[PDB]
């Protein structure tokens, strides 16, 4: 299934997420002279009712999101994806292309008032991470003990392919689909929920672009069908206490952001150890030993 394939490939080290899409290869045909080609040249000199088209039904394209943040996929990833696909494939289906997912840049700008007794560098690191997670969520690995605590049973925990790196929760996997539209009513809630934030005095979204002059509020931004949204890095938040603007040291924010991220890496790696249930063990003792009644 589609979810199985996502779980299959998401365990290649360096890959954070994958999406599986279908290719539509088109074949054109001459119904006067039965002949077919990938070119519309096949229709030269035909009447309007002598033309046909059919689309192919079992071909794949794999969209990959990696940790590297490079422009292209490493050739070692393309080999890993093609290798696993072909090793584990369905009857009458094939893989055409593996490529890195395309993106769409979004700007966020705001004026935020915080409590007079608050750590602003920490608030900034926390807001910033939360918005990034909203735009592009990713699943995490769990230990067997954790899957059990969540309330799953054996039939469900082992329902799909066995995964060497820990268990992946199907709900999280379904949730982490490419986002289609961006809305202000969610971004505001993300900021207002951060401890120490009191008032968002100004906030706006917009497609990141050049000549960003006077333009509409863009209360909802729509995203093209095969793109992932990403902050444009031209974003900014002005922090205030009462009526005075305050300045955040650039370096300290990096430390808070790193530590928050640091925990996720430690936790995924913990999951390799707990991958199986216990089986009760007995002894051995010649159960058929017999002594004469004499």
């Amino acid at each position: 299934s589609e979810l199985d394939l996502r779980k299959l490939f998401i365990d290649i080290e360096g890959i954070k997420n994958c999406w599986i899409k279908r290719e539509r290869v088109t074949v054109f045909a001459d119904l006067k002279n039965q002949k077919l080609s990938y070119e519309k040249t096949i229709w030269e000199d035909l009447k309007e009712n002598q033309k046909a088209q059919f689309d192919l039904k079992g071909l794949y394209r794999i969209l990959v999101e990696t940790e590297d943040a490079d422009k292209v996929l490493s050739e070692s990833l393309e080999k890993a994806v093609f290798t696993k696909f072909h090793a584990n494939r369905n009857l009458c289906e094939d893989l055409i292309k593996v490529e890195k997912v395309a993106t769409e840049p979004i700007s966020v700008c705001a004026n935020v008032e915080v409590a007079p007794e608050a750590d602003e560098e920490l608030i900034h690191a926390q807001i910033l991470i939360a918005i990034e997670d909203y735009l592009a969520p990713s699943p995490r690995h769990y230990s067997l003990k954790q899957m059990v605590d969540k309330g799953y049973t054996m039939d469900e925990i082992f329902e799909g392919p066995f995964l060497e790196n820990g268990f992946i929760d199907t709900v999280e996997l379904k949730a982490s689909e490419l986002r289609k539209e961006v809305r202000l009513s969610d971004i505001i809630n993300i900021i207002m929920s951060i401890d120490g934030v009191k008032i968002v005095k100004e906030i706006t979204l917009g497609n990141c672009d050049e000549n960003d002059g006077i333009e509409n509020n863009q209360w909802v931004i729509c995203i093209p069908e095969n793109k992932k949204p990403k902050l444009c890095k031209k974003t900014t938040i002005n922090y205030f206490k009462g009526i005075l603007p305050i300045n955040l040291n650039p370096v300290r924010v990096d430390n808070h952001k790193s530590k928050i991220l640091a925990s996720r890496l430690e936790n995924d790696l913990k999951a390799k150890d707990d991958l199986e249930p216990a089986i009760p063990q007995g002894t051995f003792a010649d159960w058929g030993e017999y002594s004469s009644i004499q």
């Binding site: 007079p116 007794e117 206490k241 005075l244 305050i246």
Partner: protein
Amino acid sequence: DDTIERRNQLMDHLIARFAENFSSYAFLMKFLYGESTDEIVLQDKQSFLREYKEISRER
């Protein structure tokens, strides 16, 4: 012994008993001093309590 945080909590309690409030020193002093504000602020809070009898009366 995390003295800076614990000393501030004690001072704030004593100040609160007179219905006063020094919250603004937390950031206003940062326009004057850097890391050295923690020592300065605790010294000022102690002085305030000592001088309180006259401060609240001769308004």
